[PDB]
Amino acid sequence: GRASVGRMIGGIGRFYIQMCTELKLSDYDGRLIQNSITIERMVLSAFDERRDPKKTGGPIYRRVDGKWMRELILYDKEEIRRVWRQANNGEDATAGLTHIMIWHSNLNDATYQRTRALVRTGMDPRMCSLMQGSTLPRRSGAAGAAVKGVGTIAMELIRMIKRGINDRNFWRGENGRRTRVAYERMCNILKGKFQTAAQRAMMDQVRESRNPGNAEIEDLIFLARSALILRGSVAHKSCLPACVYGLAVASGHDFEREGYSLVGIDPFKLLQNSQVVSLMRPNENPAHKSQLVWMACHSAAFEDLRVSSFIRGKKVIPRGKLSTRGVQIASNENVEIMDSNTLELRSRYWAIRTRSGGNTNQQKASAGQISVQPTFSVQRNLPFERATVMAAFSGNSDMRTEVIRMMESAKPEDLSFQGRGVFELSDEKATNPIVPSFDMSNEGSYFF
């Protein structure tokens, strides 16, 4: 794992140094995130083939006297893949391209609330904590599928069921059996992410359906809803802009020899030593730009703010409370009268990125005791699960009711990832897990 990832990370690095010299960019000027994004955007566009002539464009930026200057550079599509293959020791190296895709996906999740897409699908605009990887290209996604969220996969299934209801010739013919394969594979992606048997058993009904319609759509919404409590398995990968990888190899960092893990310490080690610059719009807070980029780098868009705070060693505050817009600068903007700052992407601690959605004791949540019946005449309180006994949803479809029953048993105060904690940046071996304790003065847990 560590060697193959190292090769991949190094490939993007070598590609970034090369492209910078190919665009004649300064050492300092090749450290801007907007430039990094443009180069990242081009490498992805050149390897599309599934979608202006046969060239890819984008805006490149460089410091003149003091103020930054914008010039839209364009290059031949084949020259870009030639530069990518050369940098990746003569190979196609698509796993490197997906890494660039995931970084963009994580950046979008920290920046834009997908509420407009939620209500337009006929879903709850409060399901955005399930929407990781919604802007992922769908193309090149075996590990892209793992990064995708329960809500995301559900939304894309509903889009299919909507399209298959407005036009009859969707499930019939040549492409009819073909689109069935794409539908059935995606259902098993969603079935995969669910941690309870009842959720999977309900997902089997949705999959094994002759011409699915309105009923299946409702089931998906229901399941998506239950994933706010009985959470699904989503993979998280710390994916950084290519400028960080380029500068590292420019410093003589042998990723193949040293080793790299997307879920381990390595991205933190790189970010602690990083020097990333971002353009600043008139009246934007650099302390806030940092947070946005930091959250995206570690895929912490929908993570508990309290936990992100404690790891960062700095207050991670809600998106609505941030004096900043997007990272990318649009065309109509005047990049002339704009200052810039070094982004603050360091952390106090590091932590292992998780593939899990949390601990769900399945049997206890369905049939276990929730109250006691007193036997002896002794002075004491009489334990019962207040919230769970109060709930009457399951009484008001058999697997549906088992899912509800488990949701009623669950409590926000319940604990997950026991014994596992954060580590110091000097604790490379991760022998000393620090169990986090949170601040009392609180900004909340939700970023949106």
Added chain:
Amino acid sequence: GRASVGRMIGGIGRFYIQMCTELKLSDYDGRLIQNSITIERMVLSAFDERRPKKTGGPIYRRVDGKWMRELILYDKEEIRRVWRQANNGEDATAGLTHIMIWHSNLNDATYQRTRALVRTGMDPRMCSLMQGSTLPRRSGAAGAAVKGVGTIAMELIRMIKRGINDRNFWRGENGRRTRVAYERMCNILKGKFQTAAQRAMMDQVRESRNPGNAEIEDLIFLARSALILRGSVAHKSCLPACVYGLAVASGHDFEREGYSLVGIDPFKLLQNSQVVSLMRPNENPAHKSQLVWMACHSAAFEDLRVSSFIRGKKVIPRGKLSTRGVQIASNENVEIMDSNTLELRSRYWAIRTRSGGNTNQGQISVQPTFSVQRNLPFERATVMAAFSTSDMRTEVIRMMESAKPEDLSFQGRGVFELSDEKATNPIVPSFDMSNEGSYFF
């Protein structure tokens, strides 16, 4: 204004003094709160025209140690002259309103209207929302200010329930007249809520054609929300007429200094008060004093901790007080009652507020990124709400879940010393959150 409210208070004082001479009440007898209530009730009865041409009630005198009751009767028209004469010729309905609020605040502190709530289909645990529930039909717009969120909700539900029984209730010239009253109240209630979701939910109740159970359920819902996302309610320190009486009798010029119902003035007056009360055997003088103190400052549903901090003496819950009502019943034996000077003084003073407190303000669950030991927060009531104006309701559910009992309100504001008249040096409480008992009822 200070001079305006000054005149008003001054008119009550002169009226009380004049009523004592008309009833030949002694200097000591006029200082009894029980006589004050009778005189106040008489001026109220004499002016509420929509109700023989006489009015009275029990009046008490001390002859040779023993308290004697004389149930007096008096000409309504004659009362009206005495009133107008005291108020420099004018009708002065403001003073009549001021006495009503005193009588109201006293009820809010003495009795709990659980019986009335259950008829309405409301939670008896919403009593902290029932300020001014004993106030008359509609007398005073300033009356509506002091009226609580639950009071108006209960008043609106009664209007809807009548319409369910009477077919013509909403129809005709009477129909459009009552409709105006319905919209008027809904808007008052709307002006009391401080969050957009609550106000938009109130827009649907107002604009509703033929309101029914669906609107009642909405109102009950809104009533509940005001237990957390609290509504704006006026709190005005109204004192018994004898207090103003003795002050005017002592040569206090209310028009000179001025007067505010939300400033130091009523506190200042209570500090120098010489109020006396009749005492049933068993009754602890200290507990009658606490009741009257709460009544005067309209602190029935205030935090007992904050009350004790201001009073400078423990303010214990209603169920722990050794006392009944301030008013003595007709079938009660007055001959065996003792009397005491009530302790109405305070250690500190604080500004009376119209605000109900602070309210907060996309996502309702976390998605773990790091493998670390912690709880995974989600909003229980909000998530489950989809298994039951539903958009507006669920938003109101969401905000109630956001707010925690520990959330700070009135930040940067505190009590003042009685010597600090202009309210310049605030003292942020020196006995805060943990355990001490907040609820009076």
Added chain:
Amino acid sequence: GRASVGRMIGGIGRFYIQMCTELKLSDYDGRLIQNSITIERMVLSAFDERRNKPKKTGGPIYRRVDGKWMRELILYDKEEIRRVWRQANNGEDATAGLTHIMIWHSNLNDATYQRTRALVRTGMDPRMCSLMQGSTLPRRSGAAGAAVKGVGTIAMELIRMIKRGINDRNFWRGENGRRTRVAYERMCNILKGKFQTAAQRAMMDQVRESRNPGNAEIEDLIFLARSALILRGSVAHKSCLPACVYGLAVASGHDFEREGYSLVGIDPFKLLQNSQVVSLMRPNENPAHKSQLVWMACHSAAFEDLRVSSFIRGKKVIPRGKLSTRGVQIASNENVEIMDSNTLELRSRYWAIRTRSGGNTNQQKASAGQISVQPTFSVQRNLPFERATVMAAFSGNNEGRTSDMRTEVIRMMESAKPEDLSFQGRGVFELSDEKATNPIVPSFDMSNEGSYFF
């Protein structure tokens, strides 16, 4: 009183002794709990009038022969067993002892098997397991067995009735139907007397008064049962030990009628101290965990707070899932020669009075009290409110059937806290403190959620 209950205990003891010698069981073989259960099974079979619907009862007897445990299935005449029962009970045919044996099997069942399969078939919540006390009892124990039954147990039976009564039309009419009604109204009354509030009882009136029992009556019953998790029913708890313990007590010259006995007092605890009870162990089972299981059944503590069980027992009482054991009884398909055996540890550090109470369900004061403040002054502070109480109203209770009494039960369930105190001043006792003079009020860890057994 203590004398009559003593007479009952001695009767069962004397019976077991004479059954041991008759069935030719060794002095030590009769100390086996599996052997005691078979003998208990037989005497219950003997007196059950279903005989008038071979005429010999029996079951497996276990003797240790040539090192290994041997199993033989013996039959015996039911009239010969009733004879031994009559001959050991000073000549009476006591029906008190039979019911006492039954409750012991009930309490053993209540600790062994979770009733979650039956509840799901009934349409009830499978988490109502803490109300399933006495569900294995036949409709054969009278008022005494009825007092031991839980709210859920009666409620389930009633639903089964109504469900059968809507599945078949000719269920409530005729001579067959008329007898069903008498049983309907009776169980409705037994359930009613268990509830300790005005609202829960008044709802039971409506269920009973019903002209045609249907889905309305079931849904109300399910509702009442659920409410018995916070506003608990008044279920009687009786310490009922296996016959072998009583048999060995008499065989040692202990006089039960002289020194008295009490099912809810110290006597069963004291008797379990000096007890020598042996059980068969399956391969891979844990001797210590079998003891725990039986001990709970001995003190009807199946659904009791494990913290309370632990403090009384002196050892740590742990949940059902984490136990390395199966049922005490051995199935006939299992090999019994491979079995080991161990003396069950049934001692206790303390003892406490067994209760018929559901706890302090007098929450009528809190139902009308304040649950929030309304600020009068402009002073910096938090503004206290009952979060759990206020938020409890958004639990979807108003969705299904509603009534005035329903809204009062819900109203009282919202006001209750899991941290509410019950049985004030009442505590455990030392074994030497036989007249229960010095109550020891224990300090349970409030940061211990490990309270439930199932």
